[PDB]
Amino acid sequence: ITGTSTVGVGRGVLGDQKNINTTYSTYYYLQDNTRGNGIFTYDAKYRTTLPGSLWADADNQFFASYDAPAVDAHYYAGVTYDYYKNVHNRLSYDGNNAAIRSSVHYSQGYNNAFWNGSQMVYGDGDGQTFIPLSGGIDVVAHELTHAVTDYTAGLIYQNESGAINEAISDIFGTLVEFYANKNPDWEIGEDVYTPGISGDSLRSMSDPAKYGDPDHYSKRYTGTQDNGGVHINSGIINKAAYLISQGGTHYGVSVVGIGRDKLGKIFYRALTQYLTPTSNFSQLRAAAVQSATDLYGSTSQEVASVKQAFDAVGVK
Ligand SMILES: [Ca+2]
Ligand SMILES: [Ca+2]
Ligand SMILES: [Ca+2]
Ligand SMILES: [Ca+2]
Ligand SMILES: [Zn+2]
């Protein structure tokens, strides 16, 4: 909408106060004009029609319980935009400052979030498996990263290419969580998963097997559930990425860690210059090796560590 840029204040899902970029024209809208061609947050009003209505507020204060998922979807989309721009010189998900749109309060009791081809969508959860999913910065960045993937490598959402797609979203979701630097970890969704159970999470990158997911290619899922295991077999790639960054010895194979920033550079380059819609795990290894070679040189520690990490998870 046309209006003047304003700064509201409110409280997110976890009860924390933050400032939000809004737009004033009669109402204050969740429209952040400070980033690209805007970040826009919508109310889906417990229904499934999308996007719903651009979020309007009378007083620019967002402290109601109903407001909290909107505050966080809007704010964490901003952090994610900043990560991609500042760290990777990428302007929004399309590289040309496309407007970023999110809807909250999608459906009833909805234990998921997704990119629908055009926008991000967040359930409120049922209060048992999840609380409103935009409360997790890793979740928000996971969703926006699906848009980045779709505009770049275009990894088809099934089987190995789909597990790579998933892992890319978990990797960058985690790197954004570290960028913001509030309780960062290598777990996925811990801030919004199972409010009645402390210390768990939806997935673990450091130890995927803790939550049932494979940590070696010989343990990959080969059935048809979950689009051929895209949220399951992502553990193999998540583990490789964790090892590249942090190091470790896994099934007897030692990996020298190179840190998060270099992990992000290698995987961003692989995603944007080498992967294709049909890439499989072996092709991801090759893309990561080539990316590290371009950035650091063929004789570098970085290349050696990429190879060790893929060896450790059984991907040749
Ligand atoms: Ca208000
Ligand atoms: Ca965390
Ligand atoms: Ca996390
Ligand atoms: Ca929990
Ligand atoms: Zn996903």
The per-residue DSSP string of the chain comes to ---EEEEEEEE-TTS-EEEEEEEEESEEESEETTSTT-EEEEE-TTSSSSS-EE-EESSSEE-SGGGHHHHHHHHHHHHHHHHHHHHH---TTTSS-PPEEEEEEESSS---EEE-SSSEEEE---SSSBS-GGG-HHHHHHHHHHHHHHHTT---SSHHHHHHHHHHHHHHHHHHHHHHTSS--SEESTTTB-TTSTT--SEESS-GGGGT--SSGGG---SSHHHHHTTTTHHHHHHHHHHHHH-EEETTEEE----HHHHHHHHHHIIIII--TT--HHHHHHHHHHHHHHHH-TTSHHHHHHHHHHHHTT--
Range of the domain at 137: 6-154
| CATH code of residue 216 | 1.10.390.10
Give backbone dihedrals phi and psi of 77, rounded to 5 degrees, phi first. Answer: -60, -40
Question: Looking at the structure, do residues 113 and 137 belong to the same domain, yes or no?
Answer: yes
Say whether both 27 and 80 belong to one domain: yes
> Resolution of the deposited coordinates, in angstroms?
1.1
Is 250 labeled as catalytic in the residue annotation? no
Question: Based on the domain organization, do 40 and 58 belong to the same domain?
Answer: yes
Same domain membership, residue 214 and residue 188 = yes
Number of domains within the chain: 2
Domain boundary residue among 132, 154, 176?
Answer: 154
Neighbours of ion ligand 2 (CB under 5 A): 183, 185
For residues 227 and 139, membership in a common domain is answered with no
Specify whether 148 is located in the same domain as 160: no
Angstrom distance (rounded) from CA 226 to CA 246: 29
- Going from the Cα of 130 to the center of ligand 4, the distance in angstroms, rounded, reads 8
Instruction: Give CA–CA dist 308/161, Å, rounded.
Output: 21
Q: Is 59 assigned a ligand-binding role in the annotation? A: yes
Experimental method: X-ray
Q: Look at residue 1 and tell me if it is in a domain.
A: no
Using the mean position of ligand 5's atoms as its centre, give its distance from the Cα of residue 188 in Å: 11
Does 105 appear as a known binding residue?
A: no
CA–CA gap between residue 199 and residue 76 (Å, rounded): 22
Active site residue 143: yes
One domain, residues 219 and 204: yes
CA of 43 to the centre of ligand 4 (A): 26
